[PDB]
Ligand binder design. Structure first.
Ligand SMILES: Nc1nc2c(ncn2[C@@H]2O[C@H](COP(=O)(O)OP(=O)(O)NP(=O)(O)O)[C@@H](O)[C@H]2O)c(=O)[nH]1
Ligand SMILES: [Mg+2]
Length: 169
């Protein structure tokens, strides 16, 4: 049968977790206008020649909401850790999300991808090489994305699936 992947998108408020998830699943960019909440989004894709089902949990970046935190972190198979390249604080916050995940999973080897989003904007304060250097320290892939243009979006999620598959040997 088809394998399903429970992917969890985490990161600071406003970095574009929802917009990435909606661009991946629905192929359009949300900004000014209203939208209905779902929080869990599903998609069939072919990655490296194997069809699979993606189940994406789009988490809140507000720290005051975390009832599901140890929940959705416990049920997730891999994590997209998102910061925005114009938000130094959200890049600094990656450490805290990676530590939360490691604790909840009780593992030093959790499938994860570091995502630097909003790479269409000119106001960059996080250098690509600095984020690459951090991802190398963790041993995980780094991808730059734009939910506005779709640059990198498929690649970020598919790379996470490839990390889960590699882990599962
Ligand atoms: N220029 C640009 N703006 C983006 C990009 N991704 C998201 N945004 C904008 O940034 C804002 C925050 O995006 P949103 O997806 O709601 O962020 P979030 O991480 O889910 N927020 P929260 O943690 O509050 O749930 C929105 O105005 C959205 O249009 C991107 O790649 N480029
Ligand atoms: Mg959101």
């Amino acid at each position: 049968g088809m394998t399903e992947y429970k992917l969890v998108v985490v990161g600071a408020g406003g970095v574009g977790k929802s917009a990435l998830t909606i661009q991946l699943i629905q192929n359009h960019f949300v900004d000014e206008y209203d939208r209905t909440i779902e929080d869990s989004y599903r998609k069939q894709v072919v990655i490296d020649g194997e069809t699979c089902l993606l189940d994406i949990l789009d988490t809140a970046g507000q720290e005051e909401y975390s009832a599901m935190r140890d929940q959705y972190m416990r049920t997730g198979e891999g994590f997209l850790c998102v910061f925005a390249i114009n938000n130094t604080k959200s890049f600094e916050d990656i450490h805290h999300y990676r530590e939360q995940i490691k604790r909840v999973k009780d593992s030093e080897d959790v499938p994860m991808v570091l995502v630097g989003n909003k790479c269409d904007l000119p106001s960059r304060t996080v250098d690509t090489k600095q984020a690459q250097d951090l991802a190398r320290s963790y041993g995980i892939p780094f991808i730059e994305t734009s939910a506005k243009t779709r640059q990198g979006v498929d690649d970020a999620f598919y790379t996470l699936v490839r990390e889960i598959r590699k882990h599962k040997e």
